[PDB]
Design a protein around this ligand. Sequence first.
Ligand SMILES: Cc1cc2nc3c(=O)[nH]c(=O)nc-3n(C[C@H](O)[C@H](O)[C@H](O)COP(=O)(O)OP(=O)(O)OC[C@H]3O[C@@H](n4cnc5c(N)ncnc54)[C@H](O)[C@@H]3O)c2cc1C
Length: 498
Amino acid sequence: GYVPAVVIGTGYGAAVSALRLGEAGVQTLMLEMGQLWNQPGPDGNIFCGMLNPDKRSSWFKNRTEAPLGSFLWLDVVNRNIDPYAGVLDRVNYDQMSVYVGRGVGGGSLVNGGMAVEPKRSYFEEILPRVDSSEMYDRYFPRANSMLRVNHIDTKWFEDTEWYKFARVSREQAGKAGLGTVFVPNVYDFGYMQREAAGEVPKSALATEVIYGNNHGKQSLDKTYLAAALGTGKVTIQTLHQVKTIRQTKDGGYALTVEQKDTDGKLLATKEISCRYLFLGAGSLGSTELLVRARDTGTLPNLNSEVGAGWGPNGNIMTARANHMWNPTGAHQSSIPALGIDAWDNSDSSVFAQIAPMPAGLETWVSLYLAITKNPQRGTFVYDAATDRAKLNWTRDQNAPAVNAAKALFDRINKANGTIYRYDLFGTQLKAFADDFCYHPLGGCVLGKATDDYGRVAGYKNLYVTDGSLIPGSVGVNPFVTITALAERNVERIIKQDV
Ligand SMILES: Cc1cc2nc3c(=O)[nH]c(=O)nc-3n(C[C@H](O)[C@H](O)[C@H](O)COP(=O)(O)OP(=O)(O)OC[C@H]3O[C@@H](n4cnc5c(N)ncnc54)[C@H](O)[C@@H]3O)c2cc1C
């Protein structure tokens, strides 16, 4: 029942932490509520694609859903399903829906693989207490290398039909005096070229991403987690969800963990104790565990900052209708490669990802996922009645985000004589999706709810390592920052505490 170190979750913060702990000789147990995705399903594949969604696509839902922005073309493939331990979870709060991965590797299993370093000037603005030289000289480079970030071949990108959708938006943005930038990725671009050449099994070129990629994507299970297990000091137990956390009579930590099967049936409740406890359950998971512990009195010394400072990384989705002479293509790589960088740290800052659409036929639609600078923050409040942390965030709090996104795309529409699509997110004439989030950030902010390295305030040997540490915004796709920060944190923690 005892293990020196326990890491809750297997996402970015968790993976980095477990690898370094293992390398330092600390026997570590990782607890993951989702599945280890390595068994072929009904179609001979581990994951289901976006055009053939089944129970594997969702975390305990009774019906599949179309990827945001593609309901008009993909609802036709939606089917009723048995609640199952699927890979993608849509967590619905009062006025916000947060998408998170569930499985060994966490969000790395379902994300777009976009590996982007935040602008240094912005990093220094959001985390002034952190030494930025150390982050850019050592931690970002280390994260880049271990994550296996790579770059797309420009010649191939320019010629391939699979990225015509990206080229169309580049041309359109150019007329408004806006340039584009290549987005590094963990998806093997060399493999992607071979897919287009019909030399290897297609994944990104076979409408796969949001429910996992059967090939090509260097998710954490192949990188950090593989290395962690390789140390001989790390083990991973799946379908194990931590419910409570308390401090033992001697300073260690005890956890109640529920083991379930893939159908969600409770198989057993175990008691696991440790000397060092690392939380890597994500922005939602780690914050909920802490607000629960504080409010139920199992960790009575947690401060008032626990639960505060949450932000959706200013996530806003919108789309533009192209002229008939600017078709985006029926064949679109599921992995984005280009983005529009209009981020100058001001309130009008927008870094938008040119997103592909899975329809498989010509729709003339250009889809974009904008990351904005919105000061609004939400707070996770514990509800003792349902034993769930509720996110206090209202839709109108995304107004500044919508405004920033709209001002940028209005410029592109004006320069091209194009208009927005208003029917992609429902039948209510909404050109901007403002109640979804792929990048949850905050809840246990670094330096507020914890010290500058993630040590939870009020406790010893208790650490938070994931996206809950970030103060609601990074101005870019978040995983590289979470990874780099985790490298910085665990290295210091092992040196001084272990
Ligand atoms: C569709 C989609 C697209 C995205 N695209 C990108 C992109 O291209 N680039 C980018 O930078 N970011 C992207 N992201 C966001 C990125 O995936 C997340 O920011 C990142 O995965 C967060 O890492 P984390 O370590 O905080 O937590 P997560 O990766 O979320 O991992 C948390 C893990 O903890 C497990 N866990 C939860 N609670 C418990 C519990 N109580 N007990 C046990 N285990 C638990 C979860 O099941 C999970 O496996 C996207 C996310 C989604 C949903």
